[PDB]
């Protein structure tokens, strides 16, 4: 649960820093869905994250 | 295999008390950071 | 590597593009460089856009740009 | 050959590894004062170097326009790569079910918390304005300002904090039990109390030990694309970039490969004078230093797999830059790096192949530390030697290190020995269950022959 | 046993058919047909790479997985010498067989004649730069050696492990596998990584990517650890995988299958990140190439089917623990490395999903279906589980 929880919160902090508060054109990188290369990474690190401390204190 | 607290008066005021603070804690710091101004 | 590009007058009265048709066939086989990209870019179609032409035949490495450039930019 | 020698009882581990810590501290062995003294003074030493160079700025170091990254990111990945052994040996043989993670995974997990600290000095240090590290992180401001998400040191600052949180939750995890046996053996009130709140009165039992296996097993399969996902990113950076040797496909894997085979080669170093020094043979055997020898040998023929495919590339591909690339690895201004790569990582590792040579203690000392120097000449390499040389001629340069960058790297060096010295003053370098469990199951394969 | 004799039935009818529809292309197209035919190879090649991969892997590392599949891993890599023999088509495309046979053009570009010689039509510079290396008689005598090495260490191995039951297997015979094994893992994974570079990666010269062949060997991993599992399935009854089995080697192999998604998933989006990122002429075509023309949907298809479907799934301890939903998932995994390696070699000739022919699918069918065939006649000449083994214990836990 915490893990997808993660995941989905890191790729909706970048959709929504990145694509809709600020639209920054940073090297002509596209603004859409079409930009989900270079969104992988921290989605996946924010999943491992919680998904870590989930185990940890639930076993706790 | 049950956890080790069921059954216990005290479970469900526990889980209350860390909702309300966590509810508190998150209004305070969105009213900071996005309303306060 | 191709960062200047030399050509005689004459060849390039018959044809301006002779400079940049050669060196593109020695590199790839073929007059016209066929460059992909994955990224998109900015139309830029109806806006102002600011560029800057440097002309080689022009220069005569003075170096006043260079003193100018210091002078206004701090 | 066998991972533990016979003669052992549930309470004889309990002893002689409780025994280490927990000592009178006026009876603490000299040997362990004097590592402690050296690892203090190279202390002194990084600080004297983080002082100066917070005062006067990154401008003491070599770096210039063309090489923007020097000795300092070199150092980073190398930290960096160092933590990664011990993660696999804690995490990856925990899945694999190996049985020599048992008496080993203690200390070099610890080498991992370490190592990963001194790393993470490096992306603040080398900041250029060090105080505005934080605008890398998501954080409310009334600017309104975000990352960019796009680049790969964002990624990275990702990547090193979720590695450094979930190592250390795993470590103390791993201790929990540990802490309940020393908080027992303590025989100091005061002693006690203080292991006892970090045992959190674990009283081990059934319905406890069964969530803390589910538990380990979960954390350890976590951690495998982790530490993978960390080195992977630590290499997209140099990838992103268009830099001719900068971007090549293979580095992700060979990354990770390197830093396997850079952190073995460190715990090979560390762990033989800790097996000799207390009475740990019993506990660490010939055994397990001839199969991390092994795992060395196979992480090492990776890295020359990679290096084969970046020349076949080089030779591969018409570009002028990838053929100037490789001439200038090879008879440029900076050769020795690129000859001195090629001698400790590839001539040294061939030895391991002979039995007898891993079986050897000080022919596997000798070839760890020709190993280590060949891994920092290898980022030298990639790093330097790229950026020195580029697409346009009129902007080539060298780069030459000055003092304050090694001041910084010997400092960093100390502060890791005081950081293990500590460790292993206070806590026990073996884990003290997971071995006696490994008795136990050691004697029900004899009962089953 | 007659599970295996109707297994092996099946993909000889699965040969024939496929082998059949491949001749009616080829009068039809000889192009189309030796065009789909190096598809087919490709493909039909990672279950014998792959299962002498895992039988010296497993030597070096011993495991309850590794005794179970022994003797399967060892039939399908003693395949591998009918397999070079199957390469000859391909030799006789880009060799002077050109002209005959109907091939207006050679099957690859650097062995057309006017591409690699100065003064010639197209006289391609970067292609006529590898011409020594890229040649016909170069690529065919570097695939030859391959071919020994791999023909040499997989009949060493099944030879002594069929002399194991004969006598002195305490230590002798199990040492030394383990150590060709050791020296073979570095040999093997150097031929299978140039096989890949000479076969795929040469179709278009003008592109390289040093992780090519790497991805490979992950995809022919997960190609026979699937292909494992599917036949674990037909033969759980065989008394000798009755007396001498447990989940526990089950639950392993559904572990590995799991690992090696994840790991062929990352090589792909490693491959894919450092392209994209770094936008530089020269690599961009490959992707571009693969996202026009409705390959787009066929990348969409392995990042979802390929990749989600299987994680999710096999993120649980049933599901693997079960031999039968672990045969349902290897099933679709097959099916799925099936699309992936088109999507790898299809769009180098065709452009265009839709211009994809029936002989592409009857290719691989065809192919794959001979391996079945073979791999099946082979595992019955020798009993599975080699009882007399020092790692025998580890079945017994
Ligand atoms: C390109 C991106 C790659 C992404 C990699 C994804 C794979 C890594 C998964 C982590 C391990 C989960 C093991 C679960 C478990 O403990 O399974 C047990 C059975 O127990 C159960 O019944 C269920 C347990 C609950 C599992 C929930 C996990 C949370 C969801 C994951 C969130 C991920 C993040 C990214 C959002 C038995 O199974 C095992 O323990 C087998 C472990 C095998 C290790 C796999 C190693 C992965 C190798 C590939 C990694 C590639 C790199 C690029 C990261
Ligand atoms: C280092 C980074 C990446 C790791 C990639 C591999 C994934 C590892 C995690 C999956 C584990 C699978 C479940 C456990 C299992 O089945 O293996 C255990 C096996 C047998 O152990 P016994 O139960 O019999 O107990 C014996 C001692 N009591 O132990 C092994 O022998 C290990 C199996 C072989 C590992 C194969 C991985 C090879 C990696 C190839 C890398 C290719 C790189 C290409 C670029
Ligand atoms: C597509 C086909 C597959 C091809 C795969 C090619 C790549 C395979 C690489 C495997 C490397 C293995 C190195 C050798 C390790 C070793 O010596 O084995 C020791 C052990 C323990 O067994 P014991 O007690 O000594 O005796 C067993 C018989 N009784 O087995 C192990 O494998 C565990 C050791 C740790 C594994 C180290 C290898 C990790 C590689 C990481 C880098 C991957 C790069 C991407
Ligand atoms: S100012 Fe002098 S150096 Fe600068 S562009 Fe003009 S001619 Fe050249």
Redesign the interface.
Known sequence: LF?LIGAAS?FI??YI??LV??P???????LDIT?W??????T???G??L???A??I??? | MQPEWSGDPEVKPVFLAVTLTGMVAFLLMVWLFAFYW | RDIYRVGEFKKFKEDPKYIAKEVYQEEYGRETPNYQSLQPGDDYTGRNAWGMTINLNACIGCNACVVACQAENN | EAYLLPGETYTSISAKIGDVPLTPPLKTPKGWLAGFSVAFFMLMIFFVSVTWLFIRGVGIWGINIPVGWGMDIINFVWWIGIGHAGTLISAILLLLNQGWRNSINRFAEAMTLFAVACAGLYPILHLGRPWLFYWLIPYPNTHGMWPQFRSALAWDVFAISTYATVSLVFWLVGLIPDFATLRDRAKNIWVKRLYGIAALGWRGSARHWHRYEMASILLAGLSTPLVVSVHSIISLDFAISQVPGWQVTVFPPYFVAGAVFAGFAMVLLLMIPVRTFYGFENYITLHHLDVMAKVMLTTGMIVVYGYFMEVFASLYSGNEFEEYLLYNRLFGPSSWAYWGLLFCNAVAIQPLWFKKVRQNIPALLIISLIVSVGMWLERYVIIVISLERDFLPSSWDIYIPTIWDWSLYIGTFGLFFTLLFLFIRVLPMINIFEMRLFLYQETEKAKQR | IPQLGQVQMLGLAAAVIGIGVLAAGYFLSPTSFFESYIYGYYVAMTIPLGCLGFLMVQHLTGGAWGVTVRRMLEAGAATLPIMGLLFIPIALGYFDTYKALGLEHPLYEWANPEVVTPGGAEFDPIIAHKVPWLSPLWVTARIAIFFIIWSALALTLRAWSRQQDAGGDAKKLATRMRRLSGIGVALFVITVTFFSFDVAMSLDPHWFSTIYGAHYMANAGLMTLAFLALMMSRVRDAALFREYVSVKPIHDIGKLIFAFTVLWTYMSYGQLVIIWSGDVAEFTPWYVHRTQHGWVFVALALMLFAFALPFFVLLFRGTKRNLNTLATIAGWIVVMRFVDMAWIILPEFREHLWDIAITDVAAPIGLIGLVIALFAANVQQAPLLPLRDPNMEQLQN
């Open positions: 893990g890191g902090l970048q820093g990145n508060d600020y920054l054109n940073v090297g002509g990188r596209p930009n290369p270079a969104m992988i990474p921290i996946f690190e924010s491992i994250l998904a870590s401390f185990a940890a639930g076993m706790i």
